[PDB]
Design a protein around this ligand. Structure first.
Ligand SMILES: Nc1ncnc2c1ncn2[C@@H]1O[C@H](COP(=O)(O)OP(=O)(O)OC[C@H]2O[C@H](O)[C@H](O)[C@@H]2O)[C@@H](O)[C@H]1O
Ligand SMILES: Nc1ncnc2c1ncn2[C@@H]1O[C@H](COP(=O)(O)OP(=O)(O)OC[C@H]2O[C@H](O)[C@H](O)[C@@H]2O)[C@@H](O)[C@H]1O
Ligand SMILES: Nc1ccc(S(=O)(=O)N[C@H]2CC[C@H](O)CC2)cc1
Ligand SMILES: Nc1ccc(S(=O)(=O)N[C@H]2CC[C@H](O)CC2)cc1
Ligand SMILES: [Cl-]
Ligand SMILES: [Cl-]
Ligand SMILES: [Zn+2]
Ligand SMILES: [Zn+2]
Lengths: 277, 282
């Protein structure tokens, strides 16, 4: 379960404002931007992380329980979730890699064909026979790739199973392949609320560093790869992403409630780019 | 500050099973439909799903203090978004189903959600609000006012006065702002329904105001994960996440939870919007 409950770092306000302008400069200059998300992007919607001060594994180690302020079904996408929806719609996000099983990226309306759910999705069951996935409105009741009790309805009666990897399960080959490709070809990789401790998920951002790519890490705690970052921002990811969206002249869109979008729509208009150097 | 009575902290959470939970939310809809004058009472449990810890919950500020641990914030006050619960309360006021809103919360989210200040009592003050000692004029700021305990903030009044601006955050011994408490008391006494959301009701007189509704036959609903001082006096106790309760209630009422346009201040309630026709109940 790795390093748990490390001390939080807060960039002071003037330093924080400077680093987000610099992140904006990097997004403006970048042809292919990939975002990597972990459990820190859902903590402000009341879903605890794993290795934060009050993380699931941190609390386990200290003989305490983690605290949920919502259910998975009642959770709302954060400001950060909705910013990533908008950044994909205006063509500034190439691909989204997430370790999160909370199902919020999908429920935010983020297009599944630009998303890798490396650790699975609590709302998604998959037919073993035909590999047809089902996005449900409630959490699939099992974890560890177990039978859910439901059968396939494709014109197949296959056994439906959850998509939640147990510790020893290898990552779904499709999601990891597309994730690896997007990471290798990216000229900017931004990590948000991940300590980057899980292989290979935590290593994909490093792939961007090959052939000159830039790496930004946004996290309250240290992460495995702080050493390799061109930019580390120690602040709440909502504060960072809301200030970034402002610099980019983009609004954070309204959440219409739980919606599933399979396929990325054609890109919307975006503001013209600043003169930089 | 040291030995202030922080009441009962870290009580076990209760969860109504799903079938019992759906039945009680329908019954709450039945009470809202039947009621002429509905008053909501909010406390720190309505903000926990936006990453602001409560006081007496399993990971509350006082609960954690008692066990030698620290509460955890997943947001700043400035970056906090109003919850589904916050936004449902905006809508319930706009369509005329909420008469008044009494909050013990200092987190500023009711005001920033766009909820009209003239239908809101902020009994414990507001982190974003400073007040002039000389002319009583209030300023709703975009950042937290840096002091607590009704202290000088360092800024002066700009009214056509130069009065000393002070924070509105009561210390343990400070009496409640007379205007907010007066309006809160009147709204509660005249209510035929008082609904409490995410308060343990342990602070006098704030926690006592919903009981005032019980006088002359009013109904009392308590929505809370933990027990509360006044569970005994409730016509209905719902043990569930207030966002799950309030989203199922809005659905039953035929109302959408509106979009948050970001931090906005509304002084005065606008004229009421249309609302769906009422079901036949009896
Ligand atoms: N609001 C916030 N803003 C910024 N950072 C935050 C915030 N809240 C928390 N953090 C940071 O967010 C970070 C969260 O890191 P970890 O808790 O390891 O979650 P993962 O996604 O990396 O865990 C990967 C897998 O490990 C598990 O076994 C599961 O399989 C997971 O899928 C912390 O450093 C916090 O400081
Ligand atoms: N998502 C949730 N859904 C439902 N209930 C919840 C949730 N989260 C928390 N709760 C419950 O919400 C309740 C919160 O109760 P307390 O923590 O005492 O906060 P107050 O507003 O009453 O504190 C009053 C004053 O006391 C202070 O000194 C300050 O001065 C305050 O202004 C708990 O029972 C939780 O179980
Ligand atoms: N932020 C979060 C998300 C899910 C949970 S959990 O369902 O309670 N357990 C996890 C299931 C997925 C597995 O990868 C790790 C264990 C707890 C916290
Ligand atoms: N949910 C919450 C809100 C504010 C805080 S706080 O600013 O850290 N302190 C409180 C301020 C109000 C006063 O009544 C008691 C102490 C902590 C938790
Ligand atoms: Cl606990
Ligand atoms: Cl894993
Ligand atoms: Zn099948
Ligand atoms: Zn003045």
């Amino acid at each position: 379960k790795g390093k748990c409950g490390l001390p939080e770092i807060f960039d002071p306000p003037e330093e924080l404002e400077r680093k987000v302008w610099e992140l904006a400069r990097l997004v403006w200059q970048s042809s292919s931007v990939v975002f990597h998300t972990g459990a820190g992007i859902s903590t402000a919607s009341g879903i605890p992380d794993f290795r934060g001060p009050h993380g699931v594994w941190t609390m386990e180690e200290r003989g305490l329980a983690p605290k949920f302020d919502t259910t998975f079904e009642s959770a709302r996408p954060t400001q950060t979730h909705m910013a990533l929806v908008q950044l994909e719609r205006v063509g500034l996000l190439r691909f989204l890699v997430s370790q999160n099983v909370d199902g919020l990226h999908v429920r935010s309306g983020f297009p599944r064909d630009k998303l890798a759910e490396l650790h699975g999705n609590m709302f998604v069951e998959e037919c073993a026979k035909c590999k047809t996935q089902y996005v449900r409105d409630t959490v699939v009741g099992t974890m560890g790739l177990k039978a859910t009790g439901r059968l396939c309805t494709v014109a197949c009666r296959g056994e439906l199973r959850d998509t939640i990897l147990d510790w020893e399960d290898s990552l779904p080959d499709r999601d990891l392949a597309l994730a690896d490709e997007a990471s290798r070809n990216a000229d900017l990789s931004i990590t948000l609320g991940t300590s980057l401790q899980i292989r290979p998920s935590g290593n994909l951002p490093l792939a961007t560093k090959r052939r000159g790519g830039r790496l930004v890490i946004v996290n309250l705690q240290p992460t495995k790869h702080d050493r390799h970052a061109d930019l580390r921002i120690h602040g709440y990811v909502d504060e960072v992403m809301t200030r970034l969206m402002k610099h980019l002249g983009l609004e954070i869109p309204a959440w219409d409630g739980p919606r599933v979008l399979e396929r990325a729509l054609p890109p919307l208009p975006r503001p013209p780019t600043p003169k930089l150097e």
